[PDB]
Amino acid sequence: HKSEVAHRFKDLGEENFKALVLIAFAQYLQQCPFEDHVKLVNEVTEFAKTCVADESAENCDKSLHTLFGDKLCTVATLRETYGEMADCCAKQEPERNECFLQHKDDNPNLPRLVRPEVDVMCTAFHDNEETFLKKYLYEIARRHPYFYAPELLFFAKRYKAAFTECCQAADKAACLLPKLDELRDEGKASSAKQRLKCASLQKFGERAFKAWAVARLSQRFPKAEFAEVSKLVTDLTKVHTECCHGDLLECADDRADLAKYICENQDSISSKLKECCEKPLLEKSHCIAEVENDEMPADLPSLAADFVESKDVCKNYAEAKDVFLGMFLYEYARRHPDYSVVLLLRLAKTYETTLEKCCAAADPHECYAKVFDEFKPLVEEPQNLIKQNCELFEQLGEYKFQNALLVRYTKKVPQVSTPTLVEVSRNLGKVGSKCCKHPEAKRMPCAEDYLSVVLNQLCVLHEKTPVSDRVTKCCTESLVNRRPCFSALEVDETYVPKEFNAETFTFHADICTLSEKERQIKKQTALVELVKHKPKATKEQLKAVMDDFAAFVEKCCKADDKETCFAEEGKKLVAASQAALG
Ligand SMILES: CCCCCCCCCCCCCC(=O)OC[C@@H](O)COP(=O)(O)OCC[N+](C)(C)C
Ligand SMILES: CCCCCCCCCCCCCC(=O)OC[C@@H](O)COP(=O)(O)OCC[N+](C)(C)C
Ligand SMILES: CCCCCCCCCCCCCC(=O)OC[C@@H](O)COP(=O)(O)OCC[N+](C)(C)C
Ligand SMILES: CCCCCCCCCCCCCC(=O)OC[C@@H](O)COP(=O)(O)OCC[N+](C)(C)C
Ligand SMILES: CCCCCCCCCCCCCC(=O)OC[C@@H](O)COP(=O)(O)OCC[N+](C)(C)C
Ligand SMILES: CCCCCCCCCCCCCC(=O)OC[C@@H](O)COP(=O)(O)OCC[N+](C)(C)C
């Protein structure tokens, strides 16, 4: 109201306010050191309490943008370090923040963050909790200027629980390390989803995003009326449009408004919200975004009575094409939360193609009469892929399932770099382990979720250093045909086997003494290289070599004087294997 800075402080609480201010600043002045930022926070934090005490103290009435920009233009070395960015300081408000927004750098040349020894962390944690966690909150925000501030903070608090528990378990690493790895993965999937959404929204336009939302909102709020889902689609689209654009405050107000609109109408939306709706403003929309689907209305009819039988199908359709198609997505989606969102859209695109071609022909009813039959194939291709992958995944276990994917893809696209094949087969291996333990009912949404980030990462890496037109064809295809396209890739027939190279297949004892999450990578690395050198090798001829290599690794690691065995026995594979596939 009179003072936006005080209202934020009374609303957030000192701790949250302090952490969000650090992130906000870390995201713009990425080259300042941690101690400069702790300095700002405290100055901004003391200034805010001035305002909390009396909303009429000087400057307390300025807008957050104006205050944030002024502080920003205060940094003495702004020009020295940021060049162009400092010229933003010569502008008037609306333009000035827009100017700062553009000079934000997604790829700063900062050194990767090296996870210290569990022991050094716990000790740092115990001796200086605040600085330990704040320093790392800073290191993460400066490296991710677009990661939405409050979610970044929701991750920070989970890193805090992780340390507070594990750092007294005596067998610390067993506790902490798995928790940290589970966190990095989420952190990465969340970040990659955000970019995915923003890039899709511009690569494919507002309509395709609204169709995606209708589907998603309907599985999620199946008892809501189509008019309520549409109102929520409209708002969800401004939110994402404004959050993609990047301005943290406008993005935060849009999300809060939506959340408060959702909580003021729970009855009209979902019976699952009462818990998310009583939480602090800071956590509200995030919680809602995470909510479990509401139980569907039990007895619901076939969509047949409104989309194929009833006269006026072409009439209600012509009248407002998208609204009608939206209703069909709504009715279909809400009946199927077992479906992935993109499947739902495959069906919508199918019905749309069919009403078009048909409504403008002899007998509408007798052209489009057989539309629901076209859904069946579409609905099982992914269903089957899940029955087979989760079953293959139970015979072999995680790591061998990863290896089976490794051989599959390498053959489909041998041109891809080994590090990319290895990291992709590994992550796709992790998606099976996750999603597969799930019941048939929640499996497809699970894999869609994860596959799209994996596939976009693979595409990005590929975009820079393009190496296969086919990957490229699948990568610049409709967001809906992406996975079907990759699943369509067949063994590459034109590929000429790679020139053999001994170095690549030579091993040493270091690997008897290397860690699991590191031994596997070299094994997986050589496996790929193996396939690339003898693509025609068969399931049996490969297993024979893989079994030899495992008896070759064991002999030179077990009951032996080691080292010399590896070059001796080693050359007795590179040539024995080389002829059992020659
Ligand atoms: C995210 C907020 C944490 C506060 C910063 C200090 C405490 C956090 C604990 C640090 C984790 C130590 C292990 C480690 O550093 O691994 C990952 C590093 O490569 C940095 O990346 P992550 O922090 O895993 O990912 C950033 C979190 N994201 C993905 C949500 C941005
Ligand atoms: C006011 C709010 C109301 C919401 C109603 C909007 C819903 C209408 C949806 C029509 C949906 C038909 C299904 C479908 O067409 O989805 C297509 C998208 O997934 C598009 O992916 P892209 O290749 O980027 O889009 C360009 C090509 N499309 C959009 C024509 C398929
Ligand atoms: C010495 C004078 C210095 C003046 C500096 C003070 C003004 C600068 C203020 C910068 C604004 C960034 C920090 C802040 O005040 O809050 C911004 C974020 O916390 C907004 O997030 P919230 O509104 O908590 O949204 C979280 C809930 N949502 C996401 C569902 C909306
Ligand atoms: C997890 C990301 C995709 C899931 C689909 C988003 C549909 C979720 C619907 C929540 C319905 C109410 C939305 C809400 O009230 O939140 C406003 C939002 O911005 C919530 O964000 P979402 O689009 O759910 O995604 C969270 C942000 N991410 C996903 C881009 C990281
Ligand atoms: C470089 C390597 C090449 C890449 C190969 C991509 C192939 C991955 C196919 C993965 C199969 C194992 C995962 C699984 O459990 O499958 C689930 C799917 O088959 C079903 O997902 P869908 O509903 O089709 O998800 C939508 C597909 N989109 C969103 C990616 C277009
Ligand atoms: C053309 C020239 C041929 C040269 C021969 C090199 C071929 C080797 C390349 C890949 C090797 C096979 C990769 C693989 O499948 O990993 C083997 C693992 O499944 C098991 O191997 P080991 O570590 O010996 O067994 C222990 C299993 N662990 C992991 C539980 C310890």
From Swiss-Prot:
Site (Not glycated) found at 2, 18, 39, 62, 71, 91, 104, 134, 157, 172, 179, 188, 193, 203, 210, 238, 260, 272, 284, 357, 370, 387, 400, 412, 430, 434, 464, 473, 498, 517, 522, 536, 539, 555, 558, 562, 572
Q: Does the keyword Phosphoprotein apply?
A: yes
Using the record's annotations, give every residue carrying the modification Phosphoserine: 3, 56, 63, 271, 417, 487
Impact noted for substituting residue 373 to N: In Nagasaki-2
Cellular location(s): Secreted
One GO MF term: copper ion binding
**Which residues take part in binding (4Z,15Z)-bilirubin IXalpha?**
238
- Looking at the UniProt record, the site noted as Aspirin-acetylated lysine sits at 197
Consequence of changing residue 80 to K:
In Vibo Valentia
InterPro entries from the UniProt entry: ALB/AFP/VDB, Serum_albumin-like, Serum_albumin/AFP/Afamin, Serum_albumin_CS, Serum_albumin_N
According to the record, mutating residue 363 to V results in: In Iowa city-1
An example Gene Ontology cellular component term from the record?
A: extracellular space
Modification sites for Phosphothreonine: 81, 418, 420
Positions contributing to Ca(2+) 2 binding? 11, 253, 257
Task: List, in alphabetical order, the GO biological process terms annotated in this UniProt record.
Answer: cellular response to calcium ion starvation; cellular response to starvation; negative regulation of mitochondrial depolarization
Give, from the UniProt record, the effect of changing residue 380 to K.
In Hiroshima-2
Q: What is the effect of changing residue 571 to E?
A: In Gent/Milano Fast
SS bond partners: 51-60, 73-89, 88-99, 122-167, 166-175, 198-244, 243-251, 263-277, 276-287, 314-359, 358-367, 390-436, 435-446, 459-475, 474-485, 512-557, 556-565
Where does the chain bind Zn(2+)?
65, 245, 247
| Subunit structure comment from the entry | Interacts with FCGRT; this interaction regulates ALB homeostasis. Interacts with TASOR. In plasma, occurs in a covalently-linked complex with chromophore-bound alpha-1-microglobulin with molar ratio 1:2 and 1:1; this interaction does not prevent fatty acid binding to ALB.
Functionally, this protein is described as follows: Binds water, Ca(2+), Na(+), K(+), fatty acids, hormones, bilirubin and drugs. Its main function is the regulation of the colloidal osmotic pressure of blood. Major zinc transporter in plasma, typically binds about 80% of all plasma zinc. Major calcium and magnesium transporter in plasma, binds approximately 45% of circulating calcium and magnesium in plasma. Potentially has more than two calcium-binding sites and might additionally bind calcium in a non-specific manner.
Disease association reads: Hyperthyroxinemia, familial dysalbuminemic: A disorder characterized by abnormally elevated levels of total serum thyroxine (T4) in euthyroid patients. It is due to abnormal serum albumin that binds T4 with enhanced affinity. Analbuminemia: A rare autosomal recessive disorder manifested by the presence of a very low amount of circulating serum albumin. Affected individuals manifest mild edema, hypotension, fatigue, and, occasionally, lower body lipodystrophy (mainly in adult females). The most common biochemical finding is hyperlipidemia, with a significant increase in the total and LDL cholesterol concentrations, but normal concentrations of HDL cholesterol and triglycerides.
Q: What is this protein called?
A: Albumin
Organism encoding this protein: Homo sapiens (Human)
Lineage of source species: Eukaryota, Metazoa, Chordata, Craniata, Vertebrata
The gene name reads ALB
